[PDB]
């Protein structure tokens, strides 16, 4: 994370140099501006493709193995050292075997590269950059130039609906009796001490043979059968039409919340797709969007909803949480809606929403700094490390004085409980 | 060192998968392990976990993955039969019903020990049968003579081509013309 125009300062740490190498301009034109302006995270895959480093590993507790490997080594002659180190590198850190392009962690996965170079490549200001961006947000969903990509789903808290119920259930009081046997039986059960069951056997003659039976067995059969029929009533009734008010919040930097009155008929999958079709109808998107529904819990957790039988359980378990001043005809539910696909316009909206969200002075400054390190852009004109640290220092030193950084931006990134304790 | 990389859960999973169909288990390794090819057991475990994280329960996920495998196999052997047909009417390929004629020959040769002369004679009269041989052959029971239906031949294969008309032109459908 090379950020800090978000805390109102220019980036430091010399990585500026790496971003300005003529190599990076070749492979990912525009990426340098993307990461320096927008505070944005690069990952292993991105650092490998840019050729910032040669080495990568998936092995647990690598450090121990390095230790024990260099314990078994013997001499100090640089022939020996060269081979030992080299063999270590080849067998683990270079990916010769058991590695794929799907598996390496990458933010800039190739559609994203195309987008970045459309937005940020070769633009002579921050201002040009955002009237460009503004013009990209405006594209329809049907244009050729609005291109989609796989979006990485931000993970839910609970991960399953059952987990949702259980998690919700610790803030509640269990009943001593399950819903189907609470209601008194239509027959009448005289309560005895426990012991008087065991003395209730009896001897009857069935056909030609002697038989020991319970005297009360049939009575208990009527009882258990009745309880089963009440269970059936209960379940069939959870499937009955549920007229609730639906809130759906689209996950993303663009706040939009859709509200509509929906009737859930959970007896004859198709119902989830009905609800999703409706949601998309209101959001103004084609009905072919791949949409992940999710349950927003009163505990501030989140679930995926994969199935209708689960959705029924969500309706039954959450009574709704409502401000009564605002009058709703039906109990609300709160869904979050994740998009399995980002469009170009969408992504651009996000990135502009961040550029507006960080200190303008440090945005413009950091742009100046990148283009000062970059220089001409030829392999020679790029500053070496020694000059880059010095330059970043020059800008940092000049910005830090301003009230913007120290008085405001420094406390920006605090946690929530920190702000609570301070308040 | 020998310690299973497979955790007990995995063990139970691919064991259940393996016991519900032997085809899936054997596919990769029938004889020796072919280890540079992917294996159905593995691919199926992969898409099983895939199903589980989309919220499909145990039973239905298993039977669904298995259905995937079986349907793929269905495709494959449909293709095999579609080409099998072509190959049989090409004339040089053989299913069991003709193979019984080959075995027939080898067995007749062994049972009654034959001189190479007798063999060549067999060949030429079986060539006569094979080509000129006729359906509907008659035996004399006398007065009364009965006709029955024989084995295959080439002349039969002609008469089948003319719609048993005995004529080369039965097709009224449009075709090219020559003058």
């Amino acid at each position: 994370i090379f950020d800090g125009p978000n805390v109102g300062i220019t980036p430091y740490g010399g990585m500026t140099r790496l971003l300005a190498r003529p190599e990076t301009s070749l492979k990912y034109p525009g990426l340098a501006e993307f990461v320096v302006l927008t505070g944005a995270s690069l990952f292993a895959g991105d650092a490998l493709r840019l050729g910032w480093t040669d080495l990568f590993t998936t092995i647990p507790d690598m450090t121990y193995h390095i230790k024990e490997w260099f314990d078994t080594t013997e001499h100090m002659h640089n022939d020996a050292v060269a081979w030992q180190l080299g063999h270590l590198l080849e067998t683990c850190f270079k990916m010769k075997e058991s590695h794929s392009s799907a598996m390496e962690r990458a933010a800039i996965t190739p559609t994203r590269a195309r987008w970045v170079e459309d937005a940020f490549a070769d633009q002579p200001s921050v201002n040009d950059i955002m009237r460009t961006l503004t013009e990209i947000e405006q594209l329809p969903f049907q244009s050729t130039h609005n291109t989609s990509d796989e979006s990485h789903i931000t993970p839910y808290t609970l991960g399953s609906v059952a987990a949702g119920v259980q998690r919700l259930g610790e803030h509640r009081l269990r009943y001593t009796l399950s819903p189907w046997d609470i209601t008194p039986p239509e027959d009448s059960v005289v309560l005895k001490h426990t012991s008087e069951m065991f003395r209730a056997y009896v001897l009857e003659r069935r056909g030609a043979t002697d038989v020991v039976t319970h005297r009360d067995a049939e009575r208990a059969a009527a009882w258990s059968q009745q309880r089963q029929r009440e269970y059936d009533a209960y379940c069939s009734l959870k499937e009955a039409p549920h007229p609730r008010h639906v809130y759906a919040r689209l996950e993303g930097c663009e706040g939009k919340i859709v509200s509509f009155e929906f009737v859930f008929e959970i007896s004859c999958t198709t119902t989830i797709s009905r609800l999703k079709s409706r949601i998309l109808d209101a959001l103004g998107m084609p009905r072919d969007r791949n949409i992940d529904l999710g349950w927003y819990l009163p505990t501030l957790d989140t679930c995926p909803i994969h199935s209708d039988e689960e959705l029924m359980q969500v309706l039954h378990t959450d009574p709704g949480i409502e401000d009564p001043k605002e009058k709703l005809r039906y109990p609300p539910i709160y869904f979050i809606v994740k998009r399995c696909t980002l469009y170009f316009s969408e992504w651009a909206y996000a990135v502009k929403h961040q550029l507006l969200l960080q200190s303008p002075f440090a945005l413009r400054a950091a742009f100046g700094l990148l283009q000062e390190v970059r220089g001409d852009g030829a392999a020679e004109n790029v500053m070496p490390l020694a000059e880059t640290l010095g330059t970043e220092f020059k800008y940092f030193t000049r910005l830090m004085r301003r009230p913007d950084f120290y008085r405001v931006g420094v406390h920006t990134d605090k946690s929530v409980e920190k702000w609570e304790e301070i308040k | 060192d020998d310690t299973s990389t497979l955790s007990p859960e995995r063990v139970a999973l691919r064991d259940e998968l393996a016991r519900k169909s032997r085809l899936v288990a054997s596919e990769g390794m029938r004889y020796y392990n072919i280890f540079w090819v992917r294996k159905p057991l593995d691919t199926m475990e992969k898409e099983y976990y895939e199903l589980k994280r989309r919220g499909v329960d145990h039973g239905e996920a298993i039977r669904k993955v298995l259905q995937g495998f079986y349907s793929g196999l269905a495709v494959k052997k449909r293709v095999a039969a579609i080409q099998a047909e072509e190959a049989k009417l090409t004339g040089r390929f053989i299913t069991m019903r003709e193979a019984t004629v080959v075995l027939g020959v080898l067995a007749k040769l062994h049972k009654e020990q034959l001189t190479p002369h007798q063999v060549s004679l067999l060949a030429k009269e079986q060539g006569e049968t094979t080509q000129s041989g006729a359906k509907l052959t008659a035996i004399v029971s006398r007065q009364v003579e009965v006709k029955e239906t024989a084995n295959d031949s080439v002349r039969q294969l002609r008469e089948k081509a003319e719609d048993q008309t005995g004529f080369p032109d039965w097709y009224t459908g449009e075709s090219p013309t020559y003058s």
């Binding site: 993970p155 808290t157 | 955790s7 859960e9």
Partner: peptide, 29 residues
């Protein structure tokens, strides 16, 4: 056991996964 071997596992920490949410999603128990 109060003494442990190199290639042998040492004692399990008792619980009495929810808390691995930050980790590899596939990482099991």
């Amino acid at each position: 056991r109060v003494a442990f071997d190199f290639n042998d596992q040492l004692h399990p920490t008792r619980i009495g996964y929810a808390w691995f949410a930050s980790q590899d999603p596939t990482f099991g128990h």
